[PDB]
Amino acid sequence: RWIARTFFDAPEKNYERTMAILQIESEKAELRLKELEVRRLMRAKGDGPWFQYPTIDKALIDHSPKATPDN
Amino acid sequence: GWVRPDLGELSKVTKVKTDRPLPENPYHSRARPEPNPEVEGDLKPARHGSRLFFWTM
Numbered sequence A: 001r002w003i004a005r006t007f008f009d010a011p012e013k014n015y016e017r018t019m020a021i022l023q024i025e026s027e028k029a030e031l032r033l034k035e036l037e038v039r040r041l042m043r044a045k046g047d048g049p050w051f052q053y054p055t056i057d058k059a060l061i062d063h064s065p066k067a068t069p070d071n
Numbered sequence B: 001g002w003v004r005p006d007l008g009e010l011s012k013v014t015k016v017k018t019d020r021p022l023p024e025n026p027y028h029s030r031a032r033p034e035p036n037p038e039v040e041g042d043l044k045p046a047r048h049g050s051r052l053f054f055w056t057m
Helices: A002-006 A011-045
Strands: none
Touching: none
8 A cells, every 4th residue: 555655656647648648649640641631632633722833923924015016 | 387207206105095995805815713712810839749650749
């Protein structure tokens, strides 16, 4: 009884530690699988803000009266 | 009559009134396909740090 009193831990302490720790890592695993599914559909269709390789910037396209009428 | 135009008075960009209307889309092209949904708003600290193999927070 003295050994359990001065050194060891209650099963309540360890049990709730296990339960909280499973909650944490279940969040981690669900976010990881959701991450890779979001990544594969976002590479497939391209609608998302990740895989957008830079196209032409149209600010340099400056329409104006040219020399030749038929451009 | 017919006064000769001074150098360089065949210049000097000119107004004129018309009768036909000014046109929309003179480049006979389609409409613009899609805008990109803009990501805005504030950002929270990340969910459990890295979510790599380990190195949690």
